[PDB]
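Sample intake — Peptidoglycan recognition protein SA CG11709-PA
Collected from: Drosophila melanogaster
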Amino acid sequence: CPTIKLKRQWGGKPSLGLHYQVRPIRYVVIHHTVTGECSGLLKCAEILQNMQAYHQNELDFNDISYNFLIGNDGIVYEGTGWGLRGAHTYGYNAIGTGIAFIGNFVDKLPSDAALQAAKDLLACGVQQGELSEDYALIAGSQVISTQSPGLTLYNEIQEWPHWLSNPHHHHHH
């Protein structure tokens, strides 16, 4: 179980409105942030503070969109957090946990530390009853119109246990 850096520990603000999920969650959606690459809490904190400000005050979300974010040093940062509905993936916010790797992974992979931290986070979520034992792992790009989490990273997660090749998606309208 990785030690999660909670909102207070990175200087983050409260959610503007909490919406609870039904546990255990059966879907994990992997994303990248594109902007914000950073190593360690000292550097990452300001980046996360301003990402939160952009999401809350410009995109009109209740909090940073992702449930968790993972930096280059392998630190797991609480975004929206376990069991709360985020805003990372239409159709998969109420029923999924969204995890973003901080950085742009179209052409490279996250660090070994970051990848191992994600694996540790998933296994811990199952152990704690946050995720179902048979959860489905998907990339954002499989269900909404996005390049996230980047082709190189998408190719990596396809080799992980739990990867689901054919997830459903609904029409917005």
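Post-analysis note: The CA atoms of residues 84 and 150 lie 25 Å apart.
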